[PDB]
Write an enzyme that holds these catalytic residues in place. Structure first.
Site, mmCIF file in Angstrom:
data_model
loop_
_atom_site.group_PDB
_atom_site.id
_atom_site.type_symbol
_atom_site.label_atom_id
_atom_site.label_comp_id
_atom_site.label_asym_id
_atom_site.label_seq_id
_atom_site.Cartn_x
_atom_site.Cartn_y
_atom_site.Cartn_z
ATOM 1 N N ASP A 264 0.841 -1.189 0.000
ATOM 2 C CA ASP A 264 0.000 0.000 0.000
ATOM 3 C C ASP A 264 0.869 1.228 0.000
ATOM 4 O O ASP A 264 0.364 2.313 -0.203
ATOM 5 C CB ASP A 264 -0.903 0.093 1.240
ATOM 6 C CG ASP A 264 -1.921 1.260 1.138
ATOM 7 O OD1 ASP A 264 -2.616 1.326 0.069
ATOM 8 O OD2 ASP A 264 -2.025 2.101 2.110
ATOM 9 N N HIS A 288 -1.493 3.937 -1.873
ATOM 10 C CA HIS A 288 -1.585 4.505 -0.513
ATOM 11 C C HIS A 288 -3.013 4.925 -0.168
ATOM 12 O O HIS A 288 -3.271 6.070 0.205
ATOM 13 C CB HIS A 288 -0.584 5.670 -0.354
ATOM 14 C CG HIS A 288 -0.097 5.891 1.052
ATOM 15 N ND1 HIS A 288 1.099 6.525 1.334
ATOM 16 C CD2 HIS A 288 -0.641 5.569 2.253
ATOM 17 C CE1 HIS A 288 1.262 6.598 2.643
ATOM 18 N NE2 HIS A 288 0.219 6.026 3.222
#
Lengths: 321, 321
Positions: A264, A288
């Site tokens: 992520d 993200h």
């Protein structure tokens, strides 16, 4: 009137709260794009308050451009590695950040990343799109699941705990965690066992990284770490990119020292489109989006707004660092 | 020697079991590709036992080709809608199927599909690959999550229960289900509330279809169903393609009657690559990988093999329908 700089277009509720403060002059970077260093130096000049984001590197330079008026920095994030904390504390500047409100969403995103990686959804999606799908096939697109698995968590804080909690009903047999210090009370709910990093890598079928980025954790997940992992194991990172050695990961994924990875976070952000890690069918990279639900982003925004406002007015903040 | 026909290459452990049966002559379709109708008729001629797949339409014609030797059909699936059950029971043929062994994996897949869909993972993945990613962005890729959500489950059998149980610790406030009959004992673990289909659609933030395909369920998820859904709601199907009206679903998705959908099954299978549903960024389609883990596929194979052999030998089967 006190000057406030906001470094980005933020969720409405937070912006309205700022627009409602009669004691404030609010200057804003009117974009979804990150503000260049030069325009941020220009924008924070004379500011009493800065509302900023993960993306913005608030170091000595920015503080200097500010300079003397600055009494409060309010970040719309739980992570703080983007702030020059030592310089900030020296200057007597207060800090607002947003713990707790994103815990459930981030843990939730972390499990989503785990499952799409280990159940191989991205390859599966593409096999549909590209004509690979011809029937139901008994041998095809099998991954590794959580039934009787061992899950290893690096950093058993609020977010890690909330990952463990969502993972337990998938049939996890044992939870292991590592950190700098045992946490019996927090671990008790899951019967988690405190272990060394080497032991964690050896024993886990799934590794989830949910720690802060600190000198102690930078480059933690490197070649020695992937070497010790089971070749059937899956590696998940939702912390910071700099926790992982990206070249070691690639190599581990390319040679089969581990089964797959889901990230992520990366280094840098954004990751270049030509990056080796993106040529790999067993690496899943998200941009993200840990805290990305409407409700959560709106709450973070209102919290940042309120931290800033209380800072300006010398009052207790709803959540101060 | 009794003749056995296997309609595809199956997992090793199952084929080893058959290959060790000295009382059996085992003919196999030597392929990962589905067997054509003509080749299947050709292959079952004189068979005492048929080991088949979900993909295989075992209708009156096949049984006729068989014909009189056939005593046992073993399917490597829990679903049975691909068998001509009334013709089979009239002919006194025994049937093996694979319940229970795939319950946890399937439930696991349905939760992965729910999370990938509502947290927008595929969009996210492509934004990294296509240069869309430029920074952390507060308003970007926001989905809807499960915190204090209402989850509606159609068909609260073993798999539905196992979906419910995985979803509970993501913060679901309320489970509802529908079916033909309340299931107090099976629902009580979740405090699930038996409700009508219209109420289900009206109240739920997430809808998961985990039922058998029958007359009562064909075309169940249609225009009126999607109209009654929240426009913020997410629709998941892991049952059979024909439970949904695909055109109504497409229209619902295109006009914003609902927020997104995630399908593990379609009509037909495979879905053509130019299908309307695959032009939609808010529709996720997997190629029917519900039970696709190595462990589960291997277990299914061994089960189907053992059901077959017990059938051939007039013994109690590990799992008979």
């Amino acid at each position: 009137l006190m000057k406030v700089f906001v470094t980005r277009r933020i969720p409405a509720e937070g912006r309205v709260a700022l627009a409602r403060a009669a004691d404030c002059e609010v200057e804003q970077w009117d974009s979804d794009e990150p503000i260049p260093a030069k325009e941020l130096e220009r924008g924070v000049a004379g500011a009493h308050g800065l509302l900023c984001l993960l993306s913005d590197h608030v170091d000595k330079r920015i503080l200097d451009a500010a300079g003397a008026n600055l009494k409060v920095i309010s970040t719309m994030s739980v992570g703080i590695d983007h702030l020059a904390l030592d310089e900030i504390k020296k200057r007597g500047i207060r800090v607002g950040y947003t713990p707790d409100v994103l815990t459930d969403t981030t843990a939730e995103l972390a499990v989503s990343l785990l499952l799409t990686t280990c159940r191989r959804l991205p390859e599966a999606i593409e096999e549909v799109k590209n004509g690979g799908w011809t029937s139901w096939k008994p041998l095809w697109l099998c991954g590794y699941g959580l039934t009787q698995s061992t899950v290893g968590i690096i950093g058993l804080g609020r977010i890690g705990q909330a990952i463990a909690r969502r993972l337990k009903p998938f049939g996890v047999q044992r939870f292991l965690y590592t950190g700098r210090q045992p946490r019996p009370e927090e671990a008790a709910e899951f019967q988690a066992e405190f272990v060394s990093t080497p032991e964690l890598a050896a024993q886990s079928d799934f590794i989830v990284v949910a720690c802060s980025l600190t000198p102690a954790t930078e480059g933690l997940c490197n070649k020695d770490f992937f070497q010790k992992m089971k070749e059937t194991a899956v590696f998940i990172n939702i912390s910071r990119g700099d926790v992982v050695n990206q070249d070691d990961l690639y190599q581990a994924l390319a040679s089969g020292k581990i089964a797959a990875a889901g990230l992520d976070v990366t280094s840098p952000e954004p990751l270049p489109t030509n990056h080796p890690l993106l040529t790999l069918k067993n690496c899943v990279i998200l941009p993200h989006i840990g805290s990305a639900t409407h409700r959560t982003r709106n709450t973070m925004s209102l919290l940042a707004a309120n931290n800033l406002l209380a800072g300006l007015r010398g009052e207790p903040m709803p959540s101060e660092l």
